[PDB]
Design a protein around this ligand. Structure first.
Ligand code: 2GO
Ligand code: BCL
Ligand code: CLA
Ligand code: CLA
Ligand code: CLA
Ligand SMILES: CC(C)CCCCCCCCCCCC(=O)OC[C@H](OC[C@H](C[N+](C)(C)C)C(=O)O)OC(=O)CCCCCCCCCCCC(C)C
Ligand SMILES: CNCCOP(=O)(O)O[C@H](COC(=O)CCCCCCCCCCCC(C)C)OC(=O)CCCCCCCCCCCC(C)C
Ligand SMILES: CNCCOP(=O)(O)O[C@H](COC(=O)CCCCCCCCCCCC(C)C)OC(=O)CCCCCCCCCCCC(C)C
Ligand SMILES: CC(C)CCCCCCCCCCCC(=O)OC[C@@H](OC(=O)CCCCCCCCCCCC(C)C)OP(=O)(O)OCCN
Ligand code: HEC
Ligand code: HEC
Ligand code: SF4
Ligand SMILES: [Ca+2]
Lengths: 858, 145, 35, 193, 35, 38, 35, 35
């Protein structure tokens, strides 16, 4: 509490309102100037990059960015404009410009104009509260720009100034004698929600009359398109409601018109809720400590975190298949010279994971900040006499250990289940022998087709149920190995691994057929013989989301489901009967019998072709029905996978793993039960320890629990990233086209570890992304310097280094070096910067898994 | 603040035709594929009778220049429609197995470098942006199965 | 819409389920101090 | 981990092959068992199973350093290339299992995103042998050292790439359980390579 | 469905072996420092 | 020191270890009890 | 001969800029934290 | 034999080199304490 600690804590709560208000208004104005520049960065003369690409789908949907507009403009407004001083537009003049460049420049300028003015008006409230300020204090870096000192004594934002430099003439909100103004923060909740309702109404008027998207049901009967004037329902997506990439009319609320009708809906709701609160503001005793801005800061901030998580979820679904993003896949997208696989989905993934990441940070930081309010209360005596039940509901220390311990138990059980299943199935997929057990892989041999006429040597047991049976090789009467055709494989049969070409399982010798004539519920339309070893395909159904999704889809699609089932049925019967006819040919034994047989097969054949084409086309019609929750790349149903089931369990376990430190902040900011047995009392929110006593105590403060939340949460977050970008999370080594994935029509990019090496071969083909990869790795491992129990070693070595450098200064007569003292971070600041370095390392590196492309092929 | 925009540079495109942005054309599928079809066919003849006079003559000037550098058109090895020639081993772009087992990024370098014996290198004939357009046109030849 | 509603309902359901467990423990261990 | 490895398969002899020549195959300097109880069975058995061109090859012998190793100049003589299935199998499975499985799978059906899948008939029909050499030699895609399909012109010899080319045509129309066997190579070679 | 009854037996033995072993190293690490 | 109860777990872990190795190495070697062969 | 000299000059500049920058980070760390 | 002797001597000269350096620093900063 003397070093660097007073720099990132210089602006703490509570604060006066004019100071919060003006500072927010200035940030708003600054964020509008930055978006201004992003509009300039989106014009059509620039390369694709990750900024202008995250904005383009939305700019298309608004009609600002026209995808099919090539005509160059040469005059538009004021007379004669080939190019000027910076030219016809400042510096945009050497370029050829279209209408969408002008729209983009118009919107960019507005943003910059309205931003700059919001910055000024915000400084009028901010500096105006203080009576006013000087150009030299506002800007502060003008003292050392000699000359300009006569215009750095001028006072701005003053109370009685001439109009153009006034600030707040009555000094503060509370003194100004306007009765409309509300005097507390509860009271003010009402005009705030009226103001927000009005911002909605503004966006809908702009949508309707400036962007020309009327609200449903007042949509136009026709729209203008690059091919002329077209009925709304046939005009393609940016212009009308017809989705080209799915080839269907869009629901009316799936369009930007749907969005302008919701503008008016939401606006009316917010205005009415504000009118209600104008007569009935919040009042209960449970809430009146929230007038302190330090306390509401906790409520608001972790609320916004939850809002951010909810944006991620809603946005993901709503837009995973929307024509805004798919339209990027036809725009010849080139980044750092390259050509991207599926840039639509990539950009979509980046926006949703960016919201996800904001959600975690703000929830955690809101809780941390709340822990600071509560520690304050304890350390001044008034925690024990808080009156709101939102504090007092959790004061009993024994309830606090019951809450925490059962959320540890729930975390434990569900993480053990998830991770334990991942481990079981990587054992299965890798065919590992443990001596005590042999893991066995999925393997499939087609049994219909022409592949069902391929022969195999088969070792057949007689009676698996008599231990001490044994088996024999299937043979001819002549003694030589009979080749069994795949159609005649039976359950129990063993085939040599090396007759199948398998070199990856050298520890066991045979594949066992465990199921014949198998057709995947969801998968390829074929019939198979299977070794299910240890691979647990049933685990897909251990997912409550498998069942809700499939039940609702069955209900919407019941009678094509039913006909597809009857087609499969008729086909399996035809296959079986055709296999018996083929077998009578094989074993016919005398050409009279062999002609009779071949003539029977020749007569059944047309009918077996009919049943196959029937099954094929019902199974194709079934696989093109609309998705509910689990989706294709073309918004079609897919069954849930082992991957989806693992992701369900990992969300429960891993978010509880990551959030148990936050419950420790909320309950144990002053005393945990380990502290309370010793009589200890944590004296501040950020102390590093108090140890070596009792074995050592590093990491009990609230600041540290915040850092341990951030780390532990890296684990569910990376589950989310792998799952968005198409990794397979249910094992560690899944290969892209392994027999299981191929037979069950699953597309994935890798499998835990394998994903990592699989995506990085794509990452290596971009030299900007490989530079990012190198820098990312270096930031991270340096966090270890700062996080290991080693600060004393670093202090005592730094000291040797300082002595030495001062010896060199004194010897060589170099005055700048005879008093060097190297600065060595203390333990608290080492933990802060260690968490910073750990976090940023990891998440630059994750950006790369998204930036490489979306390789899921659906 | 940081990305004040983002300084990514200006986009490389093809040749300019007066009054119609070439940079823009290079991201608008119907414009880029019209130029890909011209390169692919070696003529402006299969272009929509709706094509403007200026367009039809800019393409011809493009071809005439390429004819002096001994450029060989893609059609007629591969045909006007795909799926080349088994005789010459010329690739069939209509085939779905050929299409699934190629990425568009990968396809690029096989046109740049040429491919084994007969398919010629185009690195000294065409710009990398004109190869990108052709990879996009070849994509639209795919048939099912 | 159906997918968005299902996903949100499942997140709030995980919270509600945790509340119910954590309150089946509190209600039936009320005679025992944790320690 | 150690000692309790299994019994060795009697069909994999350890009987020794002749040593790799010191002289470069591209040299312009001077160009390019007994009767003891079981020594003849062991030599005959080594002649089918133990590979001769598996080892990385002298640096002057790599295809980028070989005067006749460029895609434009290599000789793809079909009579020499599809002459002997034992040999294609002996050599190409050792080279493939080592170098190519990582990215193309243990079944050779594709592991790394967008990777080839050699069992696909449509892919087989539309590739030449010379085409397959070009993509091994050059790599596929833009990047340093080839793209996502890496280049091999330092790394492999022209003779090693040719065993790879012939082996890869045994993948045609097989199922997704490991690699082509000796009789896959033989049915491929009988149906004209 | 005998593969799903067989598979499940294995998976259940895996969980007893592993979680039994984990809480076996936690019980033997308490005898080496306190009991 | 070891409790009776912790000695009776260490017995269940060994029964699961030789029910696994007995069914893994017996059919490999004795060519019987074919149900468990691979 | 001349390429080599040109390359030595770039490498020197890089060492002057990266080591130079690193020490400035230390000095700045020093001024914040204390003196 | 030649490569073995060279390597060995290069490691032994790595230690001998360092000592000499250290000896130069000690002698030429005699009478400056390093406090
Ligand atoms: C060919 C691959 C290539 C090479 C060059 C490479 C090598 C190495 C080395 C080395 C010497 O070999 C190191 C030391 C190293 C280090 C790292 N790399 Zn690294 N690395 C590569 C590539 C990359 C890339 C692109 C990325 C990393 C990422 C990272 C990161 C990871 C930091 C970290 O702690 O991350 C924790 C999260 C992990 C490991 C991901 C787990 C994902 C999984 C799907 C989650 C769910 C499943 C589990 C069983 C879950 C538990 C259950 C529950 C609690 C949720 C650091 C800098 C990083 C990352 O994983 O971040 C989460 C990252 O994004 N790396 N990495
Ligand atoms: C919606 C209610 C608000 C909230 C409103 C208030 C108000 C008002 C008060 C507090 C107060 C407290 N809150 Mg709070 N607080 C919220 C969330 C949290 C969370 C959390 C993990 O999310 C924690 C750990 C805390 C903890 C705390 C303490 C710092 C403090 C008093 C102890 C305690 O109450 O234990 C809390 C323990 C928990 C176990 C609760 C966790 C569950 C929360 C309620 C909801 C999560 C679900 C969310 C809706 C899911 C989102 C949906 C999806 C996005 C689709 N709050 C949410 C955002 N909180 C009091 C205070 O004094 O601080 C200044 C106080 O008066
Ligand atoms: C070796 C260092 C390195 C270099 C040379 C580049 C260079 C580039 N970056 Mg990368 N970048 C790096 C490291 C690097 N970056 C690291 C560590 C991160 C994580 C913070 C990033 C994150 C990143 C993003 C998200 C983006 C880039 C982009 C760019 C490009 C335009 C940059 C620019 O406008 O600068 C001028 C701007 C500043 C100096 C700051 C403002 C350019 C190709 C953009 C691009 O699209 O390229 C494809 C882009 O969107 N950069
Ligand atoms: C990049 C990795 C890195 C570097 C360069 C260092 C550097 C050092 N460590 Mg730290 N350390 C690291 C990581 C690193 N460490 C990790 C991962 C851990 C966890 C185990 C630690 C734990 C740790 C402990 C406990 C201690 C140290 C100590 C030391 C110092 C040894 C004294 C000395 O040998 O002088 C020789 C100097 C060098 C050999 C390094 C030269 C500078 C390097 C090469 C490059 C600068 C690179 C940097 C990333 C550049 C960014 C610059 C910016 C402009 C881009 C030295 C300053 C000791 C010490 O005395 O404390 C001061 C010490 O006690 N290290
Ligand atoms: C998942 C675990 C796993 C499995 C199933 C195996 C399997 C095996 N290991 Mg590997 N090993 C592993 C992990 C594993 N190892 C780990 C973590 C290490 C690092 C210490 C090693 C280090 C290793 C070496 C150095 C060796 C092997 C060897 C072996 C083989 C003989 C095993 C043996 O003799 O056992 C009986 C073992 C015991 C009864 C324990 C003693 C066998 C294939 C040998 C082999 O040659 O492989 C081809 C061998 O030389 N192991
Ligand atoms: C390092 C360690 C901490 C981790 C190591 C984990 C690796 C082992 C984990 C699994 C162990 C399973 C125990 C063996 C077991 O019971 O599974 C086999 C079981 O069959 C029992 C019989 C026992 N008869 C009756 C023969 C004596 C046997 O295995 O021999 O059913 C299966 O075989 C399941 C078959 C799978 C699909 C059908
Ligand atoms: C490339 N192919 C992957 C995507 O394929 P597709 O779109 O077909 O299928 C899914 C499935 O649906 C879900 O996956 C819904 C969540 C279920 C909750 C399951 C139950 C959740 C309960 C957890 C409660 C935790 C509490 C108690 C701490 O695609 C998605 O929706 C995933 C994208 C969304 C991104 C994740 C959003 C954040 C995760 C939840 C945040 C939680 C926080 C508020 C803490
Ligand atoms: C009284 N002593 C103890 C109590 O006080 P106490 O510990 O807070 O004092 C610290 C400690 O010392 C360090 O913490 C070491 C830094 C030097 C290592 C030097 C090594 C740094 C290199 C690391 C880079 C690796 C990354 C890139 C992977 O307080 C701080 O340094 C606080 C951190 C603030 C630093 C701000 C950096 C911004 C400067 C950027 C612009 C400078 C130049 C560009 C002009
Ligand atoms: C695995 C490990 C544990 C085992 C270590 C192996 C040890 C092997 C010992 C290495 C033996 C080398 C001799 C062979 C050789 O040097 O070859 C001929 C060499 O003739 C000699 O000088 C002969 C004199 C050799 C008398 C030296 C005895 C060595 C002592 C070992 C001490 C080990 C310690 C204590 C660490 O030729 P030239 O250099 O002239 O020509 C270049 C060759 N192109
Ligand atoms: C003279 C014939 C000829 C001309 C002209 C020709 N090609 Fe080819 N091309 C071939 C043959 C032959 C192959 C088969 C390559 C091989 O051996 O595998 C092929 C292969 C290809 C492939 C498949 C490559 C791959 O990787 O798999 C593409 C794409 C292709 N050509 C595009 C073009 C384009 C684009 C042009 C014109 C710009 C063009 N070709 C001109 C003959 C030609
Ligand atoms: C690093 C991963 C990787 C390794 C190692 C690798 N490949 Fe590939 N391979 C790919 C990818 C990715 C493709 C798809 C390229 C494309 O279209 O984008 C591919 C494609 C191919 C193609 C088809 C080329 C064509 O033009 O159609 C052949 C042939 C090929 N690989 C053979 C091999 C052989 C032989 C080896 C070992 C020598 C090998 N590969 C090693 C990743 C790899
Ligand atoms: S090593 Fe650090 S954290 Fe641990 S007791 Fe000592 S000072 Fe505290
Ligand atoms: Ca990706």
């Amino acid at each position: 509490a003397n070093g660097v600690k007073r720099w990132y804590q210089k602006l703490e709560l509570p604060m006066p309102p004019e100071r919060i208000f003006g500072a927010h208004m200035m940030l708003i104005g600054g964020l509008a100037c930055l978006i201004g520049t992003y509009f300039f960065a989106s014009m059509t003369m620039w390369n694709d990059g990750y900024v202008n690409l995250t904005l383009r789908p939305r700019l298309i949907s608004l009609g600002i960015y026209d995808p099919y507009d090539t005509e160059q403009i040469q005059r538009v407004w004021l007379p004669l404009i080939g190019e000027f001083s910076t030219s016809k537009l400042p510096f945009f003049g050497q370029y050829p410009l279209t209408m969408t460049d002008f729209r983009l420049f118009g919107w960019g300028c507005f943003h910059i104009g309205l931003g700059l003015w919001l910055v000024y008006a915000g400084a009028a409230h901010y500096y105006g509260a203080r009576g006013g300020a000087t150009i030299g204090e506002i800007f502060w870096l003008l003292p050392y720009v000699p000359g300009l000192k006569g215009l750095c004594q001028i006072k701005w934002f003053t109370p009685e100034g001439p109009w153009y430099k006034v600030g707040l003439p009555w000094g503060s909100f509370a003194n100004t004698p306007w009765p409309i103004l509300r005097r507390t923060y509860a009271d003010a909740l009402s005009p705030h929600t009226i103001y927000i309702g009005l911002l909605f109404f503004i966006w809908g008027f702009v949508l309707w009359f400036v962007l020309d998207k009327p609200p449903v049901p007042l949509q136009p009967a026709q729209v203008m398109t690059p091919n002329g004037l077209m009925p709304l329902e046939q005009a393609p997506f940016p212009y009308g409601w017809f989705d080209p990439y799915l080839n269907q009319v869009m629901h009316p609320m799936n369009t930007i018109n749907g969005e302008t009708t919701m503008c008016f809906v939401w606006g009316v709701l917010f205005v009415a809720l504000g009118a209600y609160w104008w007569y009935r503001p919040p009042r209960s005793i449970n809430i009146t400590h929230l007038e302190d801005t330090k306390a509401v800061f906790h409520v608001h901030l972790t609320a916004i975190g939850y809002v951010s998580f909810a944006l991620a979820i809603v946005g993901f679904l709503a837009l995973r298949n929307h024509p805004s993003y798919l339209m990027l896949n036809d725009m010849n997208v080139i980044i750092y010279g390259k050509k991207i696989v599926n840039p639509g989905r990539m950009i979509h993934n980046m926006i949703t994971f960016n919201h996800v990441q904001v959600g975690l940070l703000y929830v955690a930081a809101g809780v941390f900040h709340g822990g600071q309010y509560l520690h304050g209360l304890n350390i001044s005596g008034a925690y024990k006499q808080a009156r709101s039940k939102f504090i007092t509901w959790f004061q009993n220390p024994d309830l606090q250990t019951k809450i925490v311990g059962t959320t540890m138990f729930v975390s434990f059980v569900t993480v053990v289940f998830g991770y334990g299943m991942i481990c079981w199935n990587t054992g299965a997929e890798l065919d590992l022998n443990f001596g005590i057990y042999q893991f066995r892989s999925f393997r499939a041999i087609q049994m219909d087709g022409e592949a069902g006429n391929i022969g195999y040597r088969v070792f057949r047991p007689k009676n698996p149920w008599d231990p001490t049976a044994g088996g024999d090789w299937v043979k001819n009467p002549d003694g030589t190995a009979k080749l069994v055709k795949a159609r005649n494989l039976q359950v129990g049969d063993r085939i040599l691994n090396e007759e199948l070409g398998i070199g990856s399982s050298p520890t066991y010798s045979f594949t066992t057929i465990e199921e014949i004539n198998y057709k995947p519920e969801w998968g390829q339309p074929k019939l198979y013989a299977v070794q299910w070893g240890s691979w647990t395909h049933f685990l897909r159904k251990v997912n409550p989301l498998f069942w809700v999704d499939k039940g609702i889809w069955y209900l919407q699609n019941q009678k094509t489901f039913e006909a597809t089932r009857k087609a499969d049925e008729a086909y399996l019967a035809a296959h079986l009967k055709a296999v018996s006819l083929l077998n009578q040919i094989d074993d016919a034994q005398t050409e009279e019998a062999k002609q009779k047989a071949q003539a029977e097969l020749d007569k059944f054949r047309p009918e077996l072709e009919k049943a196959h084409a029937n099954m094929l086309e019902w199974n194709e019609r079934l696989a093109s029905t609309p998705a509910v929750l689990y989706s294709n790349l073309r918004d079609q149903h897919r069954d849930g996978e082992i991957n989806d089931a693992i992701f369900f369990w990992l969300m429960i376990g891993g978010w509880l793993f990551g959030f148990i430190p936050l419950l420790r902040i909320a309950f144990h900011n002053y005393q945990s039960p380990w502290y309370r047995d010793f009589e200890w009392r944590k004296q501040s929110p950020d102390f590093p320890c108090i140890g070596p006593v009792k074995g050592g105590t590093c990491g009990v403060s609230i600041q540290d629990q915040l850092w341990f939340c951030i780390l532990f949460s890296i684990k569910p977050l990376s589950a989310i990233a792998w799952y968005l970008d198409g990794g397979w999370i249910a094992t560690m080594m899944a290969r892209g086209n392994e027999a299981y994935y191929l037979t069950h029509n699953i597309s994935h990019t890798g499998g835990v570890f394998l994903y990592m090496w699989n995506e990085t071969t794509w990452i290596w083909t971009d030299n900007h992304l490989t530079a990012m990869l190198l820098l990312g790795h270096l930031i991270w491992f340096v966090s270890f310097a700062l996080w290991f129990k080693d600060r004393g070693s670093r202090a005592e070595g730094g000291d040797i280094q300082s002595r030495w450098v001062r010896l060199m200064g004194k010897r060589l007569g170099i005055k700048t070096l005879q008093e060097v003292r190297f600065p060595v971070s203390n333990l608290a600041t080492a933990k802060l910067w260690g968490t910073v370095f750990f976090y940023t390392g990891t998440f630059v590196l994750v950006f790369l898994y998204f930036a490489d492309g979306f390789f899921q092929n659906r | 603040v940081m990305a004040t925009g983002c300084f990514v540079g200006a986009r490389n495109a093809s040749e300019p035709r007066l009054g119609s942005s070439s940079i823009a054309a290079s991201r608008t599928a119907p414009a880029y594929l019209r130029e890909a079809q011209v390169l692919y066919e070696g003529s402006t003849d299969g272009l929509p009778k709706d094509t403007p006079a200026d367009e039809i003559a800019h393409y011809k000037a493009m071809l005439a220049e390429l004819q002096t550098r001994n450029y060989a058109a893609c059609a007629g090895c591969h045909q006007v429609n795909g799926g080349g020639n088994k005789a010459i081993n010329a690739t069939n772009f209509q085939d779905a197995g050929w299409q699934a087992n190629n990425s568009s990024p990968g396809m690029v370098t096989s046109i740049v470098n040429g491919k084994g014996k007969v398919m010629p290198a185009y690195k000294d004939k065409l710009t990398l942006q004109q190869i990108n357009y052709l990879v996009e046109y070849i994509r639209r030849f795919e048939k099912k199965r | 819409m159906t997918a968005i509603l299902l996903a949100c309902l499942f997140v709030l359901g995980g919270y509600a389920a945790l509340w119910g467990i954590i309150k089946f423990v509190v209600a039936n261990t009320k005679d025992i101090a944790a320690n | 981990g150690g000692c309790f490895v299994g019994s060795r398969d009697p069909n994999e002899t350890r009987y020794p092959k002749a040593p790799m020549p010191l002289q470069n195959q591209t040299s312009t300097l001077k160009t390019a068992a007994q009767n003891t109880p079981g020594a003849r069975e062991a030599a005959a058995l080594r002649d089918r199973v133990t590979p001769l061109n598996l080892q990385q090859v002298n640096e002057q012998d790599v295809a980028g350093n070989d005067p006749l190793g460029s895609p434009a100049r290599v000789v793809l003589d079909e009579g020499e290339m599809y002459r002997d299935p034992v040999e294609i199998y002996r050599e190409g499975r050792a080279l493939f299992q080592n170098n190519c499985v990582g990215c193309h799978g243990h079944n050779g059906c594709g592991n790394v995103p967008r990777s080839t899948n050699f069992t696909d008939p449509g892919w087989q029909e539309n590739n030449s042998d010379g085409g397959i050499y070009s993509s091994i030699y050059n790599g596929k895609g833009i990047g340093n050292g080839g793209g996502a399909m890496p280049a091999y012109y330092n790394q492999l010899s022209p003779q090693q790439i040719r065993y790879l080319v012939a082996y890869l045509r045994a993948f045609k129309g097989r199922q997704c359980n490991g690699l082509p066997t000796l009789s896959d190579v033989e049915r491929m070679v009988a149906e004209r390579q | 469905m005998w593969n799903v009854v067989g598979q499940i037996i294995s998976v259940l033995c895996f969980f007893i072996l592993t979680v039994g072993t984990l809480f076996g190293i936690v019980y033997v690490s308490h005898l080496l420092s306190r009991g | 020191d070891i409790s009776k109860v912790a000695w009776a777990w260490f017995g269940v872990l060994l029964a699961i270890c030789l029910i696994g190795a007995f069914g893994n190495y017996v059919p490999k070697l004795f060519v019987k009890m074919l149900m468990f062969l691979n």
